[PDB]
Amino acid sequence: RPNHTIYINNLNEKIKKDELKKSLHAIFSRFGQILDILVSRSLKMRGQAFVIFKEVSSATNALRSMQGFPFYDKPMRIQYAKTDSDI
RNA sequence: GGUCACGCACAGGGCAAACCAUUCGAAAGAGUGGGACGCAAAGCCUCCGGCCUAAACCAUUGCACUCCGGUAGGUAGCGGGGUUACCGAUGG
Ligand SMILES: Nc1nc2c(ncn2[C@@H]2O[C@@H]3COP(=O)(O)O[C@H]4[C@@H](O)[C@H](n5cnc6c(=O)[nH]c(N)nc65)O[C@@H]4COP(=O)(O)O[C@H]3[C@H]2O)c(=O)[nH]1
Ligand SMILES: [Mg+2]
Ligand SMILES: [Mg+2]
Ligand SMILES: [Mg+2]
Ligand SMILES: [Mg+2]
């Protein structure tokens, strides 16, 4: 189940792309090295985020310590992602 | 001369990009004033395609690393199409 990238769900869809990036970057940065944060506001990608950590241990700590977290008045739903391509 | 085209001019000229000031706007962008990159319809119109914006509303819980909700607004100086018009190369 565990993975380098975490998949963040049920996000407030009214927050702009670049404010959400910055807000996620300042929150999850303490858990470990963040490679990139994937956020877009298209129909299929609304309310969603992919936070990529350099190591799984930091991602597991990120997933468990902040699951169900109140974020812009919405519960954060964290599960693992399936395949981190990029490069 | 008319009409429909056309732009090698002539002639009166017309408009105004970027930038700046200011107003409106959530934004894209628009108005007004200065200002000219250009423009033979760079006059006018969102009917079709593209591009740009996302405040409100409706819809959407969606696994991405081409891009993509409806809607609403915008660009006519992004094309196409519609419409109106000045000059007239011994002009076609
Ligand atoms: N009266 C008239 N004359 C025409 C027309 N078409 C061509 N000409 C003549 O041909 C010249 C070159 O035209 P252009 O290559 O379209 O190049 C033009 C054009 O791009 C632009 N321009 C000038 N006036 C206008 C205008 O009222 N509307 C537009 N869209 N462009 C203009 O400036 C350039 C130079 O203009 P000019 O010194 O007048 O010089 C013009 C003019 O003498 C027309 O429909 N009516
Ligand atoms: Mg002249
Ligand atoms: Mg002016
Ligand atoms: Mg003409
Ligand atoms: Mg308009």
Coordinates of N, CA and C (backbone and C1' of nucleotides) in Angstrom, one line a residue, chain A residues 7 9-10 13 42-46 48 50 74 79-80 83 86, chain B residues 26-27 54-65 68-69:
Chain A
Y7 N -1.8 11.0 -2.0 CA -3.0 11.5 -2.8 C -3.9 12.2 -1.8
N9 N -7.3 14.3 -0.9 CA -8.7 14.2 -1.4 C -9.6 15.2 -0.6
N10 N -10.8 15.5 -1.2 CA -11.8 16.3 -0.5 C -11.3 17.7 -0.1
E13 N -12.4 23.4 -3.2 CA -12.2 23.7 -4.6 C -12.2 25.2 -5.0
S42 N -9.0 21.6 -13.2 CA -9.9 21.0 -14.2 C -11.0 20.1 -13.5
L43 N -12.0 19.8 -14.2 CA -13.1 19.0 -13.7 C -12.6 17.7 -13.1
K44 N -11.8 17.0 -13.8 CA -11.2 15.7 -13.3 C -10.2 15.9 -12.2
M45 N -9.6 17.0 -12.0 CA -8.5 17.2 -11.1 C -8.9 18.1 -9.9
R46 N -10.1 18.7 -9.9 CA -10.5 19.5 -8.8 C -10.5 18.8 -7.4
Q48 N -8.1 18.0 -5.6 CA -7.1 16.9 -5.5 C -5.7 17.4 -5.4
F50 N -1.4 15.9 -5.3 CA -0.3 14.9 -5.2 C 0.9 15.5 -4.6
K74 N -12.5 22.0 5.4 CA -12.7 20.7 4.8 C -11.8 19.6 5.3
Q79 N -4.7 9.2 1.1 CA -4.3 7.8 0.8 C -3.0 7.9 -0.1
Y80 N -2.4 6.7 -0.4 CA -1.2 6.6 -1.2 C -1.6 6.7 -2.7
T83 N 1.6 5.6 -9.0 CA 2.8 5.6 -9.8 C 3.3 7.0 -10.0
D86 N 6.9 11.4 -13.7 CA 7.6 12.6 -13.8 C 9.1 12.3 -14.1
Chain B
rA26 P -15.5 43.3 -8.8 O5' -14.0 42.8 -8.9 C5' -13.2 42.5 -7.7 C4' -12.5 41.2 -7.9 C3' -11.7 41.0 -9.2 O3' -10.4 41.5 -9.0 C1' -13.0 39.1 -8.8
rA27 P -9.8 42.5 -10.1 O5' -9.3 41.5 -11.3 C5' -8.3 40.6 -11.1 C4' -8.4 39.4 -12.1 C3' -8.2 39.8 -13.6 O3' -6.9 39.7 -14.0 C1' -10.2 38.5 -13.3
rA54 P -8.0 33.1 -13.6 O5' -9.4 32.9 -13.0 C5' -10.1 34.1 -12.3 C4' -11.5 33.7 -12.1 C3' -11.8 32.5 -11.2 O3' -12.7 32.8 -10.2 C1' -13.0 32.3 -13.2
rA55 P -12.1 33.2 -8.7 O5' -13.4 33.7 -7.9 C5' -13.4 34.8 -7.1 C4' -14.7 35.6 -7.1 C3' -15.9 34.7 -7.0 O3' -16.2 34.3 -5.7 C1' -16.2 36.2 -8.8
rA56 P -16.9 32.9 -5.4 O5' -18.4 33.1 -5.9 C5' -19.2 34.1 -5.2 C4' -20.5 34.4 -6.0 C3' -21.3 33.1 -6.3 O3' -22.1 32.7 -5.2 C1' -21.0 34.4 -8.3
rC57 P -22.2 31.2 -4.9 O5' -23.1 30.7 -6.1 C5' -24.5 31.1 -6.2 C4' -25.1 30.6 -7.5 C3' -25.1 29.1 -7.7 O3' -26.1 28.4 -7.0 C1' -24.4 30.2 -9.7
rC58 P -25.7 27.1 -6.2 O5' -25.8 26.0 -7.4 C5' -27.1 25.7 -8.0 C4' -26.9 25.1 -9.4 C3' -26.2 23.7 -9.3 O3' -27.0 22.7 -8.9 C1' -25.3 25.1 -11.0
rA59 P -26.5 21.6 -7.9 O5' -25.4 20.7 -8.8 C5' -25.9 20.0 -9.9 C4' -24.7 19.7 -10.8 C3' -23.6 18.8 -10.1 O3' -24.0 17.5 -10.1 C1' -22.6 20.6 -11.4
rU60 P -23.6 16.7 -8.8 O5' -22.1 16.3 -9.0 C5' -21.6 15.7 -10.2 C4' -20.1 15.8 -10.4 C3' -19.3 15.4 -9.2 O3' -19.2 14.0 -9.1 C1' -18.5 17.5 -10.0
rU61 P -19.0 13.3 -7.7 O5' -17.4 13.6 -7.4 C5' -16.4 12.8 -7.9 C4' -15.5 12.4 -6.8 C3' -16.0 11.3 -5.9 O3' -15.1 10.3 -5.7 C1' -15.2 13.1 -4.6
rG62 P -14.9 9.2 -6.9 O5' -13.8 9.9 -7.8 C5' -13.9 9.7 -9.3 C4' -13.1 10.8 -10.0 C3' -11.6 10.9 -9.8 O3' -11.0 10.0 -10.8 C1' -12.5 13.0 -9.4
rC63 P -9.9 8.9 -10.4 O5' -8.6 9.8 -9.9 C5' -8.0 10.8 -10.8 C4' -6.6 10.4 -11.0 C3' -6.3 9.1 -11.8 O3' -5.2 9.3 -12.7 C1' -5.2 9.0 -9.7
rA64 P -5.2 9.1 -14.3 O5' -4.7 10.5 -14.9 C5' -5.4 11.7 -14.5 C4' -4.4 12.8 -14.2 C3' -3.1 12.8 -14.9 O3' -3.2 13.5 -16.1 C1' -2.7 13.1 -12.5
rC65 P -2.3 13.0 -17.4 O5' -0.8 13.5 -17.0 C5' -0.4 14.8 -17.1 C4' 1.0 15.1 -16.6 C3' 2.1 14.2 -17.2 O3' 2.5 14.8 -18.5 C1' 2.3 14.1 -14.9
rC68 P -6.7 21.6 -18.9 O5' -8.1 21.2 -19.5 C5' -8.8 22.0 -20.3 C4' -10.1 21.3 -20.8 C3' -11.0 20.8 -19.8 O3' -11.9 21.9 -19.4 C1' -10.7 19.1 -21.5
rG69 P -12.5 21.9 -17.9 O5' -14.1 21.7 -18.2 C5' -14.6 20.4 -18.6 C4' -16.1 20.3 -18.4 C3' -17.0 21.5 -18.8 O3' -17.2 21.4 -20.2 C1' -17.7 20.8 -16.7

